[PDB]
Amino acid sequence: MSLIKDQMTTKLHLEGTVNGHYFEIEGNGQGEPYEGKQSMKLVVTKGAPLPFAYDILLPQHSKPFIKYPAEIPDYYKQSFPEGFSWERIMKFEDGAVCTVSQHSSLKGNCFVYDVKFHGVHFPLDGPVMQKKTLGWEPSTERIYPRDGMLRGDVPMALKVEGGGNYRCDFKTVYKAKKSVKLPENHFVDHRIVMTKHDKDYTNVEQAEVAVARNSPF
Amino acid sequence: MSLIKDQMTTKLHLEGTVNGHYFEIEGNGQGEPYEGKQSMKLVVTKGAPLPFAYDILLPQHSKPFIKYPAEIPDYYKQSFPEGFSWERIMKFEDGAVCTVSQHSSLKGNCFVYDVKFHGVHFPLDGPVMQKKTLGWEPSTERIYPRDGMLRGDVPMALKVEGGGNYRCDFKTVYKAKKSVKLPENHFVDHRIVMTKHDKDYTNVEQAEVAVARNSPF
Amino acid sequence: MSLIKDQMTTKLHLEGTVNGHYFEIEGNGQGEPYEGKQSMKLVVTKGAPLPFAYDILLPQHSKPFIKYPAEIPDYYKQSFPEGFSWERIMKFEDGAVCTVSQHSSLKGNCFVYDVKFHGVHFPLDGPVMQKKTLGWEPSTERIYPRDGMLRGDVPMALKVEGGGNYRCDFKTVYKAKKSVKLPENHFVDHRIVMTKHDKDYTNVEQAEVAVARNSPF
Amino acid sequence: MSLIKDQMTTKLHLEGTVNGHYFEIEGNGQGEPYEGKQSMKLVVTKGAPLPFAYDILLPQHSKPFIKYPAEIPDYYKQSFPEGFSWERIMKFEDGAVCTVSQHSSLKGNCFVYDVKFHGVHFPLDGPVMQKKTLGWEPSTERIYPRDGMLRGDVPMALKVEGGGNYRCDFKTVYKAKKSVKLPENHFVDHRIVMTKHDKDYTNVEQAEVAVARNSPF
């Protein structure tokens, strides 16, 4: 049994291959699950320095930290202690594709994250391989039940040098390891920021605010 | 020169072909452009009764009726009197595709809409050809400048009999016929409802509320 | 009843809208249905001069003219006299989409073609709107039965100025108006050429060779 | 320096995650590079028994074994001894996506393959998770130069129980580690067969024939 506390930690291990380059990342974070706020500090422990834009990894580093109104079932918080998995397809407008798969567990007051990240077909002259990205725009994700699990659809946008953007469609499927009450269609408004980085992004800190809601009308 | 009034009318002509079936629709509507509210009454004048779910047409029937905060440039309202065009790709999760193209002009206090609608690859046993849809869910559309024009990305969801949904990605490009001040990235929260229909949807009434905003945080 | 002759004519009417520009094309052609060879002469009768690359239209101008080995059922030839319809999605690598829908009938020794063509999201600086295309490469289309009808999948490539290419995925569905014997999986090797054009492509002649086959091993 | 011999061996290591399930495969094979023929024997060494259709892995297990006519440059054979990498996107018609990335080297007369495979969004009731596949159909892949590298586009089809198929678009990019002469547009006709398997596919043998060609006309 689990009663998620108003303060919880995170621990993350990510294995990635992007444009054939292997890397590993170790994360340690903290947040306020009921407030929809969290931060994480990350270290590239294998494959540094990364030859691609670190920004593509930010949204792969924590679904228990969404502020859910009492009226919308909280699929993520209800899954504990057994937890859940998620899988994501990232379709960039220049033909690049990432696939992501993730397991979320709970050890004491620490959520434990195990991530696989695979990125292919990044154009060598593109914003990702040329490291010309400048963080994600805020987003609104549609969350809805399907096939006894939960899906999330969000059109994402990376800021790029020159002041334009670079679009990526996220399709995510979230799977509880135990029976939980499914919500109805709703939305999550997100904002993810890289708060600090060293020169080659081997050391990064990032934060997210995420709040669930119904349509305003 | 144009000063859009707090009450304006709409007039629409749509030509469509879906799964090889030709049809035409005539619309007459009204709304409050600065309040983000409008309604329209439609008549299928050629190709009735429609052999497919009328719901796929609802979002092709009016961008001047978005409530824009003073702080976000209103691309649509600024385009008048010359107006704008839009083009949309609708990618359904069962492989069906619609393409839409539209011209918007202004005659007196009446916006005039001229629509081309093309739908292909609807599965014969699918919710659209089997008329098992039950209206659109609310949505949040990302609006952002690109290539001197405006784009909108929104993951849409049709309710279907049995209580599931049926997803459609909209990609829209909006093109002013004259120079206008482009906004920055923002969002439009939408809700579109079919308020009334006769038995075979030859006579439909529909309404939309649409409000532009920045991220809440 | 129909016995397709070793020489047959074609007559075509196409209505199109590309990047919001309306046009109509009238075609008259001829070929050798059992030899897989045909030609057609086309006139842009409305919307001339076309503001986009004519090449995108070539493959929308004739499935009875495929050389079918006796061992593979000929879905197209068997459909006559009632004929068939087809619908196509064209996904270009720069995000442009065309939808195509078509009816094929037979009047005497003349196949009669009625086409709807809709093209959206062509980038204004792209090879199509900048008329920098230099014809299609040859192709191999996979033909296979599904849902009591016939599908064709072919990765197409347009030659572009500078000597590169520009890819387009075709997904086609072919629907006989009467019961016919479905083939098994097979291939059609194609080559389509624009044999002549005037300066603004208002007058075009084109030819196709198409031969059905099994895998060579 | 390398002179590829008329008989060569293969050795392969693959790491995979499909629907969150980790596995590893070890391969040993042999073929006739100039004849376009090869075979491989595989062992699932971690993650056995696989909970998904083994068929999705067959085309990730060898580009030096294509019969190239003298008139078409052989990008793969020319890359040795330094070799090449490839990256693939597999888009299934039911929304599942695999990403694949690969390094090919040469040690003595043995090609050495190092593969990463990531599969997400396989529907739990789909042919892959329900192990209802019955091998790949033959295919024709378009091979063409882009961005100083080589691309391959092929619409693939998996046979499924009941006698239908299940389509997957492959987009592959091939990157030589050294300067080589690029070919022009051409085709590769393929046939891949699983020649033997034990009950849970922990032990598999497979073979491929692949021949490059120009258009027949």
PDB file of N, CA and C in Angstrom, chain C residues 23-64:
ATOM      1  N   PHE C  23      -8.767  24.301 -60.803  1.00  0.00           N
ATOM      2  CA  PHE C  23      -8.485  24.001 -62.232  1.00  0.00           C
ATOM      3  C   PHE C  23      -9.261  22.788 -62.706  1.00  0.00           C
ATOM      4  N   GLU C  24      -9.373  22.677 -64.039  1.00  0.00           N
ATOM      5  CA  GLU C  24     -10.040  21.537 -64.691  1.00  0.00           C
ATOM      6  C   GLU C  24      -9.154  21.112 -65.864  1.00  0.00           C
ATOM      7  N   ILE C  25      -9.138  19.819 -66.105  1.00  0.00           N
ATOM      8  CA  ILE C  25      -8.309  19.214 -67.186  1.00  0.00           C
ATOM      9  C   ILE C  25      -9.219  18.253 -67.942  1.00  0.00           C
ATOM     10  N   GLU C  26      -9.071  18.276 -69.264  1.00  0.00           N
ATOM     11  CA  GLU C  26      -9.741  17.352 -70.204  1.00  0.00           C
ATOM     12  C   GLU C  26      -8.654  16.562 -70.919  1.00  0.00           C
ATOM     13  N   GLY C  27      -8.839  15.258 -70.884  1.00  0.00           N
ATOM     14  CA  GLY C  27      -7.919  14.294 -71.488  1.00  0.00           C
ATOM     15  C   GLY C  27      -8.585  13.445 -72.547  1.00  0.00           C
ATOM     16  N   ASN C  28      -7.801  13.099 -73.568  1.00  0.00           N
ATOM     17  CA  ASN C  28      -8.130  12.097 -74.608  1.00  0.00           C
ATOM     18  C   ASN C  28      -6.895  11.231 -74.839  1.00  0.00           C
ATOM     19  N   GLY C  29      -7.059   9.925 -74.736  1.00  0.00           N
ATOM     20  CA  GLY C  29      -5.918   9.004 -74.840  1.00  0.00           C
ATOM     21  C   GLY C  29      -6.262   7.716 -75.568  1.00  0.00           C
ATOM     22  N   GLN C  30      -5.279   6.830 -75.593  1.00  0.00           N
ATOM     23  CA  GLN C  30      -5.382   5.552 -76.322  1.00  0.00           C
ATOM     24  C   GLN C  30      -4.302   4.636 -75.773  1.00  0.00           C
ATOM     25  N   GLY C  31      -4.565   3.349 -75.851  1.00  0.00           N
ATOM     26  CA  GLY C  31      -3.514   2.384 -75.528  1.00  0.00           C
ATOM     27  C   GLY C  31      -3.855   0.976 -75.899  1.00  0.00           C
ATOM     28  N   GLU C  32      -2.971   0.080 -75.478  1.00  0.00           N
ATOM     29  CA  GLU C  32      -3.032  -1.364 -75.753  1.00  0.00           C
ATOM     30  C   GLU C  32      -3.147  -2.078 -74.418  1.00  0.00           C
ATOM     31  N   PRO C  33      -4.395  -2.355 -73.958  1.00  0.00           N
ATOM     32  CA  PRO C  33      -4.616  -2.796 -72.584  1.00  0.00           C
ATOM     33  C   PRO C  33      -3.826  -4.049 -72.178  1.00  0.00           C
ATOM     34  N   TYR C  34      -3.717  -5.026 -73.092  1.00  0.00           N
ATOM     35  CA  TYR C  34      -3.035  -6.310 -72.851  1.00  0.00           C
ATOM     36  C   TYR C  34      -1.523  -6.146 -72.961  1.00  0.00           C
ATOM     37  N   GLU C  35      -1.024  -5.039 -73.507  1.00  0.00           N
ATOM     38  CA  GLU C  35       0.421  -4.782 -73.649  1.00  0.00           C
ATOM     39  C   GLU C  35       0.933  -3.903 -72.494  1.00  0.00           C
ATOM     40  N   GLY C  36       0.049  -3.295 -71.706  1.00  0.00           N
ATOM     41  CA  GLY C  36       0.444  -2.436 -70.578  1.00  0.00           C
ATOM     42  C   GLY C  36       0.954  -1.092 -71.059  1.00  0.00           C
ATOM     43  N   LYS C  37       0.444  -0.582 -72.181  1.00  0.00           N
ATOM     44  CA  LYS C  37       0.988   0.672 -72.766  1.00  0.00           C
ATOM     45  C   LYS C  37      -0.164   1.602 -73.074  1.00  0.00           C
ATOM     46  N   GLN C  38       0.036   2.894 -72.800  1.00  0.00           N
ATOM     47  CA  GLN C  38      -1.001   3.908 -73.105  1.00  0.00           C
ATOM     48  C   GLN C  38      -0.361   5.276 -73.195  1.00  0.00           C
ATOM     49  N   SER C  39      -1.080   6.210 -73.804  1.00  0.00           N
ATOM     50  CA  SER C  39      -0.680   7.627 -73.876  1.00  0.00           C
ATOM     51  C   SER C  39      -1.934   8.472 -73.649  1.00  0.00           C
ATOM     52  N   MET C  40      -1.753   9.735 -73.295  1.00  0.00           N
ATOM     53  CA  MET C  40      -2.904  10.650 -73.153  1.00  0.00           C
ATOM     54  C   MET C  40      -2.426  12.055 -73.454  1.00  0.00           C
ATOM     55  N   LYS C  41      -3.317  12.828 -74.082  1.00  0.00           N
ATOM     56  CA  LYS C  41      -3.114  14.251 -74.407  1.00  0.00           C
ATOM     57  C   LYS C  41      -4.076  15.069 -73.544  1.00  0.00           C
ATOM     58  N   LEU C  42      -3.563  16.054 -72.813  1.00  0.00           N
ATOM     59  CA  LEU C  42      -4.371  16.783 -71.808  1.00  0.00           C
ATOM     60  C   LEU C  42      -4.351  18.275 -72.095  1.00  0.00           C
ATOM     61  N   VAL C  43      -5.462  18.917 -71.742  1.00  0.00           N
ATOM     62  CA  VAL C  43      -5.633  20.381 -71.885  1.00  0.00           C
ATOM     63  C   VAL C  43      -6.150  20.936 -70.553  1.00  0.00           C
ATOM     64  N   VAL C  44      -5.442  21.888 -69.963  1.00  0.00           N
ATOM     65  CA  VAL C  44      -5.966  22.654 -68.783  1.00  0.00           C
ATOM     66  C   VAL C  44      -6.998  23.636 -69.346  1.00  0.00           C
ATOM     67  N   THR C  45      -8.281  23.371 -69.116  1.00  0.00           N
ATOM     68  CA  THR C  45      -9.437  24.120 -69.696  1.00  0.00           C
ATOM     69  C   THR C  45      -9.963  25.209 -68.747  1.00  0.00           C
ATOM     70  N   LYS C  46      -9.666  25.101 -67.449  1.00  0.00           N
ATOM     71  CA  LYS C  46      -9.970  26.122 -66.417  1.00  0.00           C
ATOM     72  C   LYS C  46      -8.808  26.182 -65.428  1.00  0.00           C
ATOM     73  N   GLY C  47      -8.418  27.398 -65.033  1.00  0.00           N
ATOM     74  CA  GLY C  47      -7.365  27.644 -64.037  1.00  0.00           C
ATOM     75  C   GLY C  47      -5.983  27.752 -64.644  1.00  0.00           C
ATOM     76  N   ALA C  48      -5.856  27.866 -65.975  1.00  0.00           N
ATOM     77  CA  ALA C  48      -4.532  27.975 -66.633  1.00  0.00           C
ATOM     78  C   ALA C  48      -4.020  29.415 -66.517  1.00  0.00           C
ATOM     79  N   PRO C  49      -2.702  29.683 -66.369  1.00  0.00           N
ATOM     80  CA  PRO C  49      -1.666  28.654 -66.297  1.00  0.00           C
ATOM     81  C   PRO C  49      -1.603  28.106 -64.870  1.00  0.00           C
ATOM     82  N   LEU C  50      -1.284  26.823 -64.721  1.00  0.00           N
ATOM     83  CA  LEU C  50      -1.222  26.215 -63.378  1.00  0.00           C
ATOM     84  C   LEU C  50      -0.039  26.832 -62.657  1.00  0.00           C
ATOM     85  N   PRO C  51      -0.225  27.242 -61.384  1.00  0.00           N
ATOM     86  CA  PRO C  51       0.857  27.813 -60.586  1.00  0.00           C
ATOM     87  C   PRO C  51       1.757  26.778 -59.886  1.00  0.00           C
ATOM     88  N   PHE C  52       1.535  25.481 -60.129  1.00  0.00           N
ATOM     89  CA  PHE C  52       2.290  24.396 -59.450  1.00  0.00           C
ATOM     90  C   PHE C  52       2.774  23.379 -60.499  1.00  0.00           C
ATOM     91  N   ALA C  53       3.718  22.534 -60.082  1.00  0.00           N
ATOM     92  CA  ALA C  53       4.306  21.460 -60.909  1.00  0.00           C
ATOM     93  C   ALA C  53       3.239  20.499 -61.402  1.00  0.00           C
ATOM     94  N   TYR C  54       3.078  20.491 -62.718  1.00  0.00           N
ATOM     95  CA  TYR C  54       2.154  19.592 -63.421  1.00  0.00           C
ATOM     96  C   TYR C  54       2.441  18.122 -63.070  1.00  0.00           C
ATOM     97  N   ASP C  55       3.692  17.754 -62.809  1.00  0.00           N
ATOM     98  CA  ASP C  55       4.105  16.348 -62.544  1.00  0.00           C
ATOM     99  C   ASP C  55       3.197  15.708 -61.481  1.00  0.00           C
ATOM    100  N   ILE C  56       2.686  16.469 -60.505  1.00  0.00           N
ATOM    101  CA  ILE C  56       1.886  15.829 -59.405  1.00  0.00           C
ATOM    102  C   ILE C  56       0.622  15.202 -59.995  1.00  0.00           C
ATOM    103  N   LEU C  57       0.137  15.678 -61.148  1.00  0.00           N
ATOM    104  CA  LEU C  57      -1.092  15.154 -61.789  1.00  0.00           C
ATOM    105  C   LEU C  57      -0.850  13.896 -62.645  1.00  0.00           C
ATOM    106  N   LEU C  58       0.379  13.636 -63.111  1.00  0.00           N
ATOM    107  CA  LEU C  58       0.612  12.590 -64.147  1.00  0.00           C
ATOM    108  C   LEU C  58      -0.025  11.278 -63.707  1.00  0.00           C
ATOM    109  N   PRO C  59       0.247  10.747 -62.484  1.00  0.00           N
ATOM    110  CA  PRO C  59      -0.299   9.437 -62.094  1.00  0.00           C
ATOM    111  C   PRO C  59      -1.797   9.439 -61.765  1.00  0.00           C
ATOM    112  N   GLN C  60      -2.495  10.571 -61.894  1.00  0.00           N
ATOM    113  CA  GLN C  60      -3.963  10.579 -61.681  1.00  0.00           C
ATOM    114  C   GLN C  60      -4.690  10.436 -63.031  1.00  0.00           C
ATOM    115  N   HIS C  61      -3.962  10.500 -64.162  1.00  0.00           N
ATOM    116  CA  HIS C  61      -4.525  10.400 -65.541  1.00  0.00           C
ATOM    117  C   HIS C  61      -4.422   8.962 -66.049  1.00  0.00           C
ATOM    118  N   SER C  62      -5.091   4.906 -64.846  1.00  0.00           N
ATOM    119  CA  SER C  62      -5.761   4.332 -66.031  1.00  0.00           C
ATOM    120  C   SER C  62      -5.414   2.840 -66.024  1.00  0.00           C
ATOM    121  N   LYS C  63      -5.979   2.174 -65.041  1.00  0.00           N
ATOM    122  CA  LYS C  63      -5.582   0.841 -64.551  1.00  0.00           C
ATOM    123  C   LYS C  63      -5.925  -0.288 -65.519  1.00  0.00           C
ATOM    124  N   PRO C  64      -6.853  -0.161 -66.496  1.00  0.00           N
ATOM    125  CA  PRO C  64      -7.049  -1.245 -67.452  1.00  0.00           C
ATOM    126  C   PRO C  64      -5.849  -1.533 -68.349  1.00  0.00           C
TER     127      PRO C  64
END
